[PDB]
Amino acid sequence: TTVLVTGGAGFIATHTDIELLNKGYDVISVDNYGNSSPVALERVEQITGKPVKRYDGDVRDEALMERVFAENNIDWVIHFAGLKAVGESVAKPIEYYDNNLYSTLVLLKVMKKHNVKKIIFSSSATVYGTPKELPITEETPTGGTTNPYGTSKLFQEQILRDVHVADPSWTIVLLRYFNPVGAHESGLLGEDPKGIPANLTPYVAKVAVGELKEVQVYGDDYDTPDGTGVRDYIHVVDLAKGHVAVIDHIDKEGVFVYNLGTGHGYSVLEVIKAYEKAAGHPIPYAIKPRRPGDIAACYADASKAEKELGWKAELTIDDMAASSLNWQTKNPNGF
Amino acid sequence: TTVLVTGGAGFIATHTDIELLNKGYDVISVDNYGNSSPVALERVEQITGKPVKRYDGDVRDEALMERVFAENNIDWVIHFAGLKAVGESVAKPIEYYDNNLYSTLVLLKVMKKHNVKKIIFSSSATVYGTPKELPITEETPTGGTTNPYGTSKLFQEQILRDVHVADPSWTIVLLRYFNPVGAHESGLLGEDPKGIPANLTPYVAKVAVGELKEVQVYGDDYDTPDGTGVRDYIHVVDLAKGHVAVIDHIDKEGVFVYNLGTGHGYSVLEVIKAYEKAAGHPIPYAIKPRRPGDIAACYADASKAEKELGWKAELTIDDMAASSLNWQTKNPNGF
Ligand SMILES: NC(=O)c1ccc[n+]([C@@H]2O[C@H](COP(=O)([O-])OP(=O)(O)OC[C@H]3O[C@@H](n4cnc5c(N)ncnc54)[C@H](O)[C@@H]3O)[C@@H](O)[C@H]2O)c1
Ligand SMILES: NC(=O)c1ccc[n+]([C@@H]2O[C@H](COP(=O)([O-])OP(=O)(O)OC[C@H]3O[C@@H](n4cnc5c(N)ncnc54)[C@H](O)[C@@H]3O)[C@@H](O)[C@H]2O)c1
Ligand SMILES: O=c1ccn([C@@H]2O[C@H](COP(=O)(O)OP(=O)(O)O[C@H]3O[C@H](CO)[C@@H](O)[C@H](O)[C@H]3O)[C@@H](O)[C@H]2O)c(=O)[nH]1
Ligand SMILES: O=c1ccn([C@@H]2O[C@H](COP(=O)(O)OP(=O)(O)O[C@H]3O[C@H](CO)[C@@H](O)[C@H](O)[C@H]3O)[C@@H](O)[C@H]2O)c(=O)[nH]1
């Protein structure tokens, strides 16, 4: 079984690539390295002793995607390629919509043309907006999105649902990830965005090891116990394993929806404290204004994925922080 | 004042082009003639005695759109370019999403780059789905869309709203058209799609003049008085005049929303009867199964546009049918 992994050099993709290769799948990557390094795929190969067939370029490049499908016999696609910062999306809506919607559309066109009709889409807790109830289930209504990123994910979900209406031989798996953190136990791979990290934990990891000065806490006036945002952090290895469980268990047509989270919510301040415990020293932080697009609190009821896929994310916030720092200590400037 | 009219050779665009030119605006067209003829723009020029500067090609062609903006000093854009059949959209979602979303995204990118920040978007009563109340106002909730076409219009509305969040110097006018019908009084221009017409009235006009055999009535089991779909038909000339009223009256930043309809709903059977009255003979029809994506009934409360723009659509269903047949009798195979 061959899996095409778009954005295949990114944070969640590289961890997924490991888990797929360890389970004897063959893996192909396409990535434009806008938020990642080609060295990450070298590390996947190092960890697994298995090849990743690498293509360099943009998922919106129809000629490139045509080559990918013409040169390979692909069974499944996992579509990670996307821009993913809630705050940046509010400021750069067209960059987000172009990248995120048009990558999906070009990919679907090529997949249809080659009759490859099994996709896992990297969707997001952001599709629930300000959650109608907590914890969030797959029955919690979507919509009320607060930022173009989240809107783009909900749009993409609908586009995919409409592909299945028009051709019900498709298998569409909408995985709504919550907030992955951490690194493969080896410390040879981890989260390495380009520029200043937009996500909380890679920023915190850099402050812990002295590569950035001060954690910027975006808002302390949310309707949460300590005022800072609450999220369901999931170890990136657990999330990666979730993808293998889908491909292991779903071999029929249909639209399938799963929340992938732990069910444990942690505030920003609690995350910093988990890193302080892992580092053995204070990590400087400052209270800053709210970031546009952020909501107060979201976390998952992932019962459905446990029942249907046999999968649960049990690595802890301490496992996340420790594995993160292990990577960052060994690789303080990343790749 | 120069207006770029994308889809500028289409049904509603060509009527709008006339009304703009008669009011002393300068008009530029870009169209790929997927559902129209270049001859239509010759007829606009004939009617008005004014030029239409013509570009041939696709709004998704960034190099073409760059040329359009580099070669001309554009004040306003009216974005008509789109695929527009509810039923076809259910069967061809990716064609619809690609054409409709990516044309908009390429256009916005170029407009931003040239600091042209005034747009009228051709939106649709379909954004209301199955209407929460009748008649529909601009306060009627959107969503519940029943077909990828309608979904694509609601998506585009949100993309445009997000452009204004990111740069509130924009003027965004979302015009939700109901169902335009009819032809310029000259009969030298009218509705001329390529292929078998997907809309009701061009099909009915062709059956009336013997160019098609039988009106296909899609469903007679809707929750309406006679069982057939109910719509708010608006004379295409009134709708065209609505666009001039926007540009005449709105010269400030902001997001502005208008329903453009008559407030008079007519069933399919009533439309056929209006054409029979205009033709002076029966027009054969048959009851057929429902078309995917169609809803029972929608019509507009257009009070807001009357107050804010001084505009009302008062041409009648008889004016629509008669002007339609006048065009079709003079041009039985269109252009
Ligand atoms: N918290 C999370 O990190 C989280 C949660 C839910 C969903 N997601 C989604 O999961 C996916 C992956 O997230 P991640 O944390 O691994 O981010 P990431 O930035 O590390 O990975 C995405 C990758 O896609 C690549 N890419 C982006 N657009 C591309 C394009 N047009 N063509 C080719 N390559 C492109 C980037 O270069 C990068 O390697 C994204 O779609 C994201 O929205 C992430
Ligand atoms: N009842 C109606 O007809 C109605 C109601 C509400 C909204 N609308 C919207 O109004 C607009 C115009 O409707 P119309 O009835 O004039 O249809 P139309 O098909 O006559 O006009 C649209 C035009 O756009 C052109 N076009 C389509 N995609 C293009 C692309 N990518 N690049 C260049 N040109 C392209 C076509 O060739 C055509 O000339 C559409 O966006 C439609 O969705 C129509
Ligand atoms: O430097 C930072 C970064 C973040 N935060 C806060 O930390 C929390 C998590 O923020 P972040 O890591 O930016 O993640 P989210 O915005 O919750 O979004 C992530 O999680 C979503 C699913 O929940 C994914 O879809 C997104 O792609 C991914 O970026 C939020 O409360 C932020 O306000 C800070 O205080 N400082
Ligand atoms: O051959 C036909 C065509 C249509 N209908 C019916 O006639 C009505 C109008 O149909 P149609 O002309 O296809 O228009 P709509 O589907 O209502 O959509 C039009 O009106 C929308 C705004 O209401 C626009 O956004 C769309 O682009 C435009 O195609 C509907 O009840 C249809 O079921 C028939 O019975 N036979």
Question: What CATH code is carried by the domain that includes residue A141?
Answer: 3.40.50.720
Nearest partner of A240 among A68, A78, A36, judged by Cα: A78
Residue A252 token pair: 């029929």
Is the link from the previous residue into B38 a cis peptide, with omega within 30 of 0?
no
Domain with A140 in it: 1-181+232-261
Cα A106 to Cα B329: distance, rounded to the nearest angstrom: 43
- Are A64 and A55 in contact by the 8 Å Cβ rule? The answer is yes
Single-letter residue type at A280: G
b/e sequence B166-189, b meaning 16+ C-beta within 10 Å: beeebbbbbbbbbbbbbbbeebbb
Residue A163 token pair: 């592909």
- Partners of B53 in the beta sheet? B28
Residues A94, B108: C-beta atoms closer than 8 Å: yes
Cα A295 to Cα A216: distance, rounded to the nearest angstrom: 16
Is the link from the previous residue into A135 a cis peptide, with omega within 30 of 0?
yes
Q: Is A287 exposed, middle or buried (0-12, 13-18, 19+ CB in 10 A)?
A: middle
Nearest partner of B274 among B285, B289, B260, judged by Cα: B285
- Are B1 and B57 members of one domain? yes
Residues B166, A98: C-beta atoms closer than 8 Å: no
Q: A165: helix, coil or strand? A: helix
Nearest partner of A259 among A305, A295, A296, judged by Cα: A305
Cα B258 to Cα A296: distance, rounded to the nearest angstrom: 34
Cα A182 to Cα A325: distance, rounded to the nearest angstrom: 8
Q: How many domains does chain B have?
A: 2
* Boundary (domain end) residue, out of A209, A240, A261: A261
3-state per-residue secondary structure call for chain B: CEEEEECCCCHHHHHHHHHHHHCCCEEEEEECCCCCCCHHHHHHHHHHCCCCEEEECCCCCHHHHHHHHHHCCCCEEEECCCCCCHHHHHHCHHHHHHHHHHHHHHHHHHHHHCCCCEEEEEEEHHHHCCCCCCCECCCCCCCCCCCHHHHHHHHHHHHHHHHHHHCCCCEEEEEEECEEECCCCCCCCCCCCCCCCCCHHHHHHHHHCCCCCCEEEECCCCCCCCCCCEEEEEEHHHHHHHHHHHHHHCCCCEEEEEEECCCCEEEHHHHHHHHHHHHCCCCCEEEECCCCCCCCEECECCHHHHHHHCCCCCCCHHHHHHHHHHHHHHCCCCC
- Are A330 and A187 in contact by the 8 Å Cβ rule? The answer is yes
Nearest partner of A132 among A297, A330, A279, A324, judged by Cα: A297
| Closest residue by CA, ligand 3 atom 9 | A200
DSSP designation for A289: P
b/e sequence B107-124, b meaning 16+ C-beta within 10 Å: bbbbbeeeebbbbbbbbb
Q: Which structural technique was applied?
A: X-ray
Ligand 1 atom index nearest CA of A34: 37
Angle of helix A11-22 relative to helix A236-249, nearest 10 degrees, comes to 50
Nearest partner of B240 among B254, B224, B260, B221, judged by Cα: B260
Cα A269 to Cα B267: distance, rounded to the nearest angstrom: 61
* Half-sphere exposure of residue A272: CA atoms within 13 angstroms, side-chain side: 19
- Are B20 and B48 in contact by the 8 Å Cβ rule? The answer is no
Cα B78 to Cα B69: distance, rounded to the nearest angstrom: 14
Single-letter residue type at B13: A
| Start-to-end C-alpha separation, chain B | 30
Residue A289 token pair: 């204004």
Q: Identify all chain B residues contacting A90, using CB atoms and an 8 Å cutoff.
A: 162, 165-166
Residue B116 token pair: 């042209």
Q: What is the maximum alpha-carbon separation in chain B? A: 57
Task: Specify the long-range contacts of residues A276-279, CB closer than 8 Å, at least 24 apart.
Answer: A276/A208, A277/A318, A277/A321, A278/A208, A278/A318, A278/A321, A278/A322, A278/A324, A278/A325, A279/A208, A279/A209, A279/A325
- Are A128 and A173 members of one domain? yes
Single-letter residue type at A196: I
- Are A84 and A56 members of one domain? yes
Cα A304 to Cα B292: distance, rounded to the nearest angstrom: 32
Q: A39: helix, coil or strand? A: helix
Residue B110 token pair: 């170029």
The CA distance from A279 to the nearest CA of chain B, in Å, is 39
Q: Identify all chain B residues contacting A83, using CB atoms and an 8 Å cutoff.
A: none
Single-letter residue type at A305: A
Nearest partner of A261 among A134, A108, A141, judged by Cα: A134
List Cα–Cα distances, A233 to A163, A200, B7, B207, in angstroms: 31, 11, 47, 63
Residues A93, B155: C-beta atoms closer than 8 Å: no
Q: Is A144 left (phi over 0), alpha (psi -120 to 50) or beta?
A: left
Cα B75 to Cα B250: distance, rounded to the nearest angstrom: 13
DSSP designation for A186: T
Cα A301 to Cα A219: distance, rounded to the nearest angstrom: 26
Q: How much distance in Å is there from the Cα of B335 to the middle of ligand 3?
A: 56
- Strand pairing class (B118-124; B230-235): unpaired
Q: Is B43 exposed, middle or buried (0-12, 13-18, 19+ CB in 10 A)?
A: buried
- Are A214 and A239 members of one domain? no
- Are A84 and A212 members of one domain? no
Residues B108, A101: C-beta atoms closer than 8 Å: no
Q: How much distance in Å is there from the Cα of B77 to the middle of ligand 2?
A: 14
Cα B97 to Cα B90: distance, rounded to the nearest angstrom: 11
| Closest residue by CA, ligand 2 atom 42 | B84
Cα A257 to Cα A174: distance, rounded to the nearest angstrom: 5
**Phi and psi at residue A118, to the nearest 5°:** -130, 120
Residue B221 token pair: 């089991």
Q: Is A136 exposed, middle or buried (0-12, 13-18, 19+ CB in 10 A)?
A: buried
Sequence-distant (6+) residues with CB within 8 A of B195 are none
Angle of helix A268-279 relative to helix A317-330, nearest 10 degrees, comes to 60
DSSP designation for A131: -
Mutate to test the interface with B, among A100, A159, A255 (most CBs of B within 10 A): A159
**Phi and psi at residue B4, to the nearest 5°:** -85, 125
- Partners of A257 in the beta sheet? A174
Cα A201 to Cα A239: distance, rounded to the nearest angstrom: 16
**Phi and psi at residue B130, to the nearest 5°:** -75, 110
| Start-to-end C-alpha separation, chain A | 30
Nearest partner of B125 among B311, B294, B11, judged by Cα: B294
- Are A234 and A180 in contact by the 8 Å Cβ rule? The answer is yes
Cα B265 to Cα B261: distance, rounded to the nearest angstrom: 10
Element (H, E) at A245: helix A236-249
b/e sequence A199-232, b meaning 16+ C-beta within 10 Å: bbbbbbbbbbbeebeebbbbbbebebeebbbbbb
- Are A65 and A266 in contact by the 8 Å Cβ rule? The answer is no
DSSP designation for A99: I
Q: What is the maximum alpha-carbon separation in chain A? A: 57
Mutate to test the interface with A, among B61, B92, B105 (most CBs of A within 10 A): B105
Interface residues of B toward A, Cβ cutoff 8 Å, are 90-94, 97-98, 101-102, 105, 108-109, 112, 143, 148, 151, 155, 158-159, 162-163, 165-166
- Hunting for tokens 């719509």 — which residue is that? B231
- Are A126 and A40 members of one domain? yes
* Half-sphere exposure of residue A91: CA atoms within 13 angstroms, side-chain side: 7
Q: How much distance in Å is there from the Cα of B149 to the middle of ligand 2?
A: 11
- Are B128 and B197 members of one domain? no
Just list the catalytic residues of B. 149
- Return the sign of the alpha-carbon dihedral for residues A77, A81, A306, A128: negative
What resolution, expressed in A, was reported for this entry? 1.8
DSSP A105-117: HHHHHHHHHTT--
Residue A325 token pair: 């720092």
Cα A74 to Cα A126: distance, rounded to the nearest angstrom: 30
What CATH number has the domain bearing residue B197? Answer: 3.90.25.10
Beta strands in chain A (DSSP E): 2-6, 26-31, 53-56, 76-79, 118-124, 171-177, 179-181, 215-218, 230-235, 254-260, 265-267, 285-288, 297-298
Sequence-distant (6+) residues with CB within 8 A of A304 are A137, A138, A258, A259
- Are A131 and A96 members of one domain? yes
- Are B102 and B121 members of one domain? yes
Residue numbers after which chain B is interrupted (C to N above 2.5 A) read: none
- Are B335 and B286 members of one domain? yes
**Phi and psi at residue A143, to the nearest 5°:** 110, -175
Cα B92 to Cα B97: distance, rounded to the nearest angstrom: 9
Cα B1 to Cα A155: distance, rounded to the nearest angstrom: 36
- Are B116 and B224 members of one domain? no
- Are B281 and B153 members of one domain? no
Element (H, E) at A208: helix A200-208
